[PDB]
């Protein structure tokens, strides 16, 4: 219904677009209790998370959180250029809401 990631971001409070136009520099993944998450960085040091699933997520988001972590791993290993990230900026690191690749 939004046609692109910028319009999607504008539908939510506490978000912003980061324009990276760069491949992921590092990919980190944890299975440790209460920290079942992924973190990625870019060569400029920008750091981002896919949050641990929690009470801030509705049920429909659970499959999507898993899909995002799958997308970040393949994007890292194929050196895919990421165009933009939409994130919640009230989290540290900023938490990924959406990704675009072009």
């Amino acid at each position: 219904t939004p046609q692109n990631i910028t319009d999607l971001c504008a539908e939510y409070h506490n978000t912003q677009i980061h324009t990276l136009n760069d491949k992921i520099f590092s990919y980190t993944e944890s299975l440790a209790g209460k920290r079942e998450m992924a973190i990625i960085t870019f060569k400029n040091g920008a750091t981002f998370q896919v949050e641990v699933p929690g009470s801030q997520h509705i049920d429909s988001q659970k499959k999507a959180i898993e899909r995002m972590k799958d997308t970040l791993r393949i994007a890292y290993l194929t050196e895919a250029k990421v165009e933009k990230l939409c994130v919640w900026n009230n989290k540290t690191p900023h938490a990924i809401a959406a990704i675009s690749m072009a």
Binding site: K63, E66, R73, I74, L77
Partner: protein, 232 residues
């Protein structure tokens, strides 16, 4: 390391992608080994140049952009548009002067040639050349893998002496270093078509083995999306 090689070619990027790379003459796809072309470095290096050398199962490159441009201007004049492909080093690449030694036919050209062609993933990108003028902008290839190819170099000459492809009666096979690497039926071996058949089969085996490494790198990345638990 991250050294690059360069090749002028009239074939455009879309065709390169469909072909699986920059292919030798007669070969329409990299991995599709249905019809098996001749692989012979000596024959390849001696081939005549309206194309930059790409016959007999290898594709030639230069060691700098300027060198490849100058060659492009010599050989591809009268293509209003051509491309200079920027190519990573990897162990499918042979330094022709090193492998053929004093029998390298065009040693001033300092050519480096890829056995079986240059897979798409080994292509960093390309410049467009319009009426001989290099466009300033390098177009980057999405199929390229930098960490992979920047950790690799060209084949050492010792891996190529046995593939040099000299005729059985050529004196190279009786000289160092090739005498230590001569295929069956070549050189001082009794009654030196065996030599050429063995050059061919050794080249096919090299390419089979090399192709397994490309498949492993590229097709494993293509399968790094699988999430088991989501199906379990």
């Amino acid at each position: 390391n991250d050294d690059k090689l360069y090749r002028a070619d009239s074939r455009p990027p879309d065709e390169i992608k469909q072909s699986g790379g920059l292919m030798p003459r007669g070969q329409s796809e990299y991995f599709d080994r249905g019809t098996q072309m001749n692989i012979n470095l000596y024959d390849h290096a001696r081939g005549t140049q309206g194309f930059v050398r790409h016959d007999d199962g290898y594709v030639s490159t230069s060691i700098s952009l300027r060198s490849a441009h100058l060659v492009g201007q010599t050989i591809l004049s009268g293509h209003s548009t051509y491309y200079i492909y920027v190519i990573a080093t990897a162990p499918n690449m042979f330094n022709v002067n090193d492998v053929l030694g004093a029998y390298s036919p065009h040693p001033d050209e300092q050519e480096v040639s890829a056995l079986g062609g240059i897979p798409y993933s080994q292509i960093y990108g390309w410049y467009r050349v319009h009426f001989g003028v290099l466009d300033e902008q390098l177009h980057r290839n999405r199929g390229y893998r930098d960490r992979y190819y920047s950790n690799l170099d060209i084949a050492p000459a010792a891996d190529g002496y046995g593939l040099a492809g000299f005729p059985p009666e050529h004196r190279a096979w009786r000289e160092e270093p090739w005498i230590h690497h001569a295929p069956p039926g070549c050189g001082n071996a009794p009654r030196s078509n065996t030599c050429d058949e063995k050059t061919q089969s050794l080249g096919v085996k090299f390419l089979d083995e090399y192709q397994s490494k490309v498949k492993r790198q590229i097709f494993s990345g293509y399968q790094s999306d699988i999430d088991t638990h989501n199906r379990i």
